[PDB]
Amino acid sequence: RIAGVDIPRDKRVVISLTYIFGIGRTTAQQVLKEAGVSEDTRVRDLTEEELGKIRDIIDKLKVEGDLRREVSLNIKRLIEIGSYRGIRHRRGLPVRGQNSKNNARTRK
Template identity: 30%
Template sequence: MPEDNEELKHIVRILNVDLNGHSPVQMALTGIRGMGRRNARLLSQKADIDPNETLGLLSDEAISRLREVVEAAQSHLPVWMTNRRKDLLTGEDKHLMGTDLVLTQREEMDIIRKTRSYRGIRHERGLRVRGQKTRSTGRRGATVGVSRKKK
């Protein structure tokens, strides 16, 4: 940390998300939905920025470079690192981040609910979707214990 904190930006805005300026670049970028530590490290290196450098201490030019790389993340990431491989609607590989990811997931959930697929019905009922056992786990909400007979 430098002695004069005048140049430290406390909040840096990338992809409509306020990121903490006090944390390292790779950790701050994980505040964006759809961005993990590995992606953040790779994208910060693509922008010629040290991933361990404090985000708020970067120059405006470096932040704009980082912003451009993050917005065009799909072209910088290898196919196996993308989060939407073989998209249901388009069939192409995508990497979605921020509000795009949230909206796409919500639309997909609506589709599987409307088609009344097994997964959709399980989601509606709040049950396990991926084949887990439900006999003794996943109990939340109202307790089902044994009730005593009144005398």
């Protein structure tokens, strides 16, 4: 368990960290580099020491509920100014200048 997330055992560490909300490939890569540990080792084949080090590096990053809240307070902020983007957030329409007529289904 890392940052309160049960990362999978069978897959490699880099992959298992991508599941951790707030960690992608390149974050997982520079975590394990900063941990001074092989990035080819497996989670099932790691050490509790190595886990500790990985866990210490990840504590410096904003991940999971910490990050989810940061993102959510932005949704607040935009609906708290009635900004174009705010209104696009609450309406469920594209917020960055994408057309609606067709090809907007992710939002709609």
